[PDB]
Design a binder for this molecule. Structure first.
Ligand code: GDP
Ligand code: MG
Length: 167
């Protein structure tokens, strides 16, 4: 089993910090906001040895075979906003709508991620995000790429969402 995961969201929410934290177990001070790269790691999720294939999107809006491939053939999607960034949360609808267009489905496995929960500058409330994920029928996970809180949980929950879609 090998799960193909796509990390989407507005620029600056921490998509690249979340990915590097999962794969490389550390918080990167700086990561080129224009770099869009694919990352694989073997992990054990719920006693299940599997390989994760993660595309860290940059939102280049350019001709990419790999990115249009991961959007089409990617089986799960992390929808990431920042809890200190109201706009990125208002942006979540555009990203979910775009995913449903690439997959031809209502029920694509997805997770809503609220990153940077270590910050006190909170503009998006837990209930506000919980109440949106409720409408989509997807899970909501609170993360911080800096402290690693919820990083494994977010990525592993998405895999578990993928598992219930095969059944
Ligand atoms: N405090 C805090 N800062 C974060 C977190 N995640 C990302 N950042 C910062 O947010 C900025 C943008 O993050 P980045 O991963 O490049 O976002 P991307 O554009 O979506 O790829 C960087 O300066 C990071 O240091 C977090 O969980 N907590
Ligand atoms: Mg990035």
């Amino acid at each position: 089993t090998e799960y193909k995961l796509v990390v989407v969201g507005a620029d600056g929410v921490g998509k690249s910090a979340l990915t590097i934290q999962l794969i490389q177990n550390h918080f990167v001070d700086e990561y080129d906001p224009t770099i869009e790269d694919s990352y694989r790691k073997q992990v054990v999720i719920d006693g299940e040895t599997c390989l994760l294939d993660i595309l860290d999107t940059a939102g280049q809006e350019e001709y990419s075979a790999m990115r249009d491939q991961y959007m089409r053939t990617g089986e799960g999607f992390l929808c990431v906003f920042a809890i200190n960034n109201t706009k990125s949360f208002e942006d979540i609808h555009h990203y979910r709508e775009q995913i449903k267009r690439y997959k031809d489905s209502e029920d694509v496995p997805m997770v809503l991620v609220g990153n940077k929960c270590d910050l006190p500058s909170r503009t998006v409330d837990t209930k506000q995000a919980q109440d949106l994920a409720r409408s989509y029928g997807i899970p909501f996970i609170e993360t911080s790429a800096k402290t690693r809180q919820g990083v494994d949980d977010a990525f592993y929950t998405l895999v578990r969402e993928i598992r219930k879609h095969k059944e």
